[PDB]
Design a protein around this nucleic acid. Structure first.
Ligand SMILES: Nc1ncnc2c1ncn2[C@@H]1O[C@H](COP(=O)(O)OP(=O)(O)NP(=O)(O)O)[C@@H](O)[C@H]1O
Ligand SMILES: Nc1ncnc2c1ncn2[C@@H]1O[C@H](COP(=O)(O)OP(=O)(O)NP(=O)(O)O)[C@@H](O)[C@H]1O
Ligand SMILES: [Mg+2]
Ligand SMILES: [Mg+2]
Lengths: 343, 7, 333
DNA sequence: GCATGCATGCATGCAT
DNA sequence: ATGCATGCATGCATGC
């Protein structure tokens, strides 16, 4: 429908903020969001949710959107059930660490449920972890891992969140030379099992090593593929054109170029990823606002486009990931013959 | 060769 | 205009003191000074200012001049509010143990920020840390590190210094464990964010590895390369010759020695560093005054010049630092 | 065997 | 007479 004309009366910061807050609900995003929401609505004896998408596809934005949706849905019940907390999302390693430190993960998870009215709980069962009636929850550095793990388990059971979110979970594979991938997944499964809280794992195609390592984790896991748009499928091309036209209409500038016709160039420099294209357009708009120009030129797009080498590397990475995730009827027949009564 | 004022 | 001619009748101590006080504003120093002041005037969201350079270029002199000029600027605003502290600066302490001691650094930062008008913030939430029976602050030994860090944060936010200077910040790199190196800088960053005070770090090329452990550090900080004068480019050679001419004209001696023609030897020993050149010339002038000589000969320069091995090691270190700073980030913007 | 720094608990001196 | 605050002794926790 186009951005409102009142934005042009505002300086560059407000226009860029409006463009950043603007979101497009493309059909693939809508389908994946619906699937994930329905999966959260009924875990059905599953402790893991594996959502893997390429870089700049919209996994994080999907996480915030779904978190806000569960918060809004639970609020009417949360008026009377004030003790409950519907969602909680943390990163695996917030400040980069060459290694994943379990203890750091549990400390972050436990501190990421704080509320100003901490009277709901009164206790975690472990010394050195209670706060002095403050919104800031303090964890003593000398507390051993199993005890504060017990505290986190008790907090998760009492608070009863609907789903635990682990964004950018590709960092779980950054083991401190232990090479204990199955042990790490077993620890996470045990946590989910004694806590009864559904765990959602979000990350790139790197975590496919986490996918089917063991049968127990295979049954406990639910696989969701955040598919990108590919130029092979005509409907994907049409959706990409629709996203391009919507972003062209909603970017706050006096005039906009016919960037829809350049869809081949955009797909080449974005690999059909909504998040990457949005970041590219945000960079272009930031450059234009720095220039305070009223138009976008082809050179504006080409200045802050993705490098050729980066596109080549990510294309191969994504194609390999999709081939790994690809399924064929041949596999179904092989499995049926292995079980028996093949046809 | 330009003389420099004290810093 | 040269040195005052009246100083020739003054004793040798006065002439030596005058030469020591005299400073040269060579173009690289002026550029670095202006960049540092403009960065101080507007934080631009950067909590750190890194100014690294070869040893003996004048980082300490730059810091001192910045502190003096900032005090001069802040005096009219200090007239109204006496509680505000314009600038706090303190050299980093090289620890005798492998691990850096943050407790001693915090205590010394509190001592540096000491204000004679103690009545403004006489209580930081401390256990007797405030001064008693003497002007200096008496830090209680048994005070734990987190509490004293909280007291330091309270004092910093109460005084709100314009900029915080940490001289010789390369001592922060001194840590017991290799993987533990990542923690000191983020602790200092968290302290800066909690206080909101602009921190500036000065040091040699040793901190370059400590500087760029991640791209976030580059994003959240401003880099200032105190470049030396390189004989490769004729412009730096001309600047070095002009600096030598100025030192020649300002050196308190009866006859001005022709130091310009020996510029190759000076670059051989000073390696394009103005501070080392000033130290060498001060030593030579001291010997001249003690001998009560009238001119400077090449033997005088050779007697007090740095050894060839010292120069080789210094050149190797500075060349390695320059090559490591030649790192490039060619990627999508 | 030990060193060395830090935290805690108890004893005691002082002030109200 | 008693409560509070600080100084000292000892354990401890890690390192050598
Ligand atoms: N639906 C959307 N509408 C508009 N902008 C979007 C949308 N999804 C993503 N973006 C933009 O793309 C950015 C990155 O999206 P994000 O959700 O981090 O993608 P990702 O595939 O999870 N990337 P990674 O950090 O590699 O996992 C966002 O911060 C937005 O600027
Ligand atoms: N540009 C200059 N003009 C005049 N004198 C200078 C200049 N730079 C340095 N000096 C003098 O030389 C001395 C030594 O220089 P200094 O500023 O200590 O070097 P530095 O590079 O900071 N040394 P360090 O940081 O310990 O490796 C100063 O204290 C001044 O006395
Ligand atoms: Mg993401
Ligand atoms: Mg110095």
């Amino acid at each position: 429908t186009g951005f409102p004309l009142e934005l042009l009366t505002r300086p560059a910061t407000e226009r860029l903020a409006y463009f950043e807050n603007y979101t497009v609900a493309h059909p693939r995003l809508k389908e994946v969001y619906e699937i994930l929401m329905r999966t959260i609505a009924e875990p059905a004896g599953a402790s893991f949710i594996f959502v893997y998408g390429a870089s700049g596809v919209g996994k994080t934005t999907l996480r915030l959107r779904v978190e806000q949706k569960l918060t809004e849905l639970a609020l009417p019940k949360l008026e009377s059930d004030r003790a409950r907390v519907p969602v909680v999302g943390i990163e695996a390693i917030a400040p980069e660490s060459r290694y994943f430190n379990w203890k750091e993960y549990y400390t972050r998870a436990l501190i990421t449920l704080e509320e100003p009215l901490i009277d709901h709980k009164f206790d975690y069962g472990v010394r050195g972890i209670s706060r002095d009636n403050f919104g800031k929850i303090n964890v003593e550095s000398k507390v051993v891992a199993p005890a504060l793990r017990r505290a986190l388990e008790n907090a998760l059971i009492h608070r009863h969140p609907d789903v635990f979110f682990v964004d950018e979970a590709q960092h779980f594979g950054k083991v401190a030379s232990g090479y204990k991938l199955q042990d790490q997944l077993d620890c996470l499964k045990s946590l989910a099992n004694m806590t009864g809280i559904l765990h959602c794992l979000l990350g790139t195609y790197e975590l496919l090593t986490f996918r089917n390592l063991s049968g127990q984790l295979s049954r406990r896991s639910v696989d969701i593929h955040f598919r990108r748009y590919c130029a092979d499928s005509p409907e994907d091309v049409q959706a990409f054109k629709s996203v391009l036209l919507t972003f062209q209409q909603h970017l706050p500038l006096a005039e906009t170029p016919n960037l829809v016709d350049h869809w081949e160039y955009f797909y080449e420099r974005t690999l059909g990823c909504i998040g990457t294209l949005k970041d590219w357009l945000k960079r272009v708009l930031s450059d234009a606002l720095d220039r305070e120009a009223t138009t976008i030129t082809l050179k504006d797009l080409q200045k802050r486009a993705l490098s050729v080498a980066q596109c080549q590397k990510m294309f191969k990475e994504i194609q390999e990931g999709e081939r790994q995730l690809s399924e064929t009827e041949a596999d179904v027949q092989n499995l049926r013959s292995a079980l028996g009564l093949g046809a | 060769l330009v003389v420099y004022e004290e810093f």
